[PDB]
Amino acid sequence: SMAPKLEERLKVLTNKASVMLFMKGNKQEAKCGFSKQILEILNSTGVEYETFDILEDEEVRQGLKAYSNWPTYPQLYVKGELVGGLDIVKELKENGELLPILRGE
């Protein structure tokens, strides 16, 4: 029951870059917590990625939860599909699976 205009805005945003991070804050100042922690992990990978600050856009903050059926932030997207949040990204990192996922494999 999502409005088609919101569906479109969210599909566009999630494809804004190959690797796209929805977070509290931005690359210069991430909110203490899960958003800052995931930024640190992404940084250590050396991959190019972009961020979007869901604290400054409530429509996207609430919309993306419905769009991705995922209740929390941060949300990492790769090639337009949800990967997950910090817990998933850490698990991937632990298993040596994070880099392949960031390259779309």
Ligand SMILES: *SC[C@H](NC(=O)CC[C@H](N)C(=O)O)C(=O)NCC(=O)O
């Ligand atoms: S994320 C909010 C801040 N907490 C921490 O960074 C805790 C880090 C410690 N290493 C830990 O407990 O694991 C925080 O409390 N900021 C100050 C405040 O008054 O909110």
Ligand SMILES: [Cl-]
């Ligand atoms: Cl997660």
Ligand SMILES: [Fe+3]
């Ligand atoms: Fe948090």
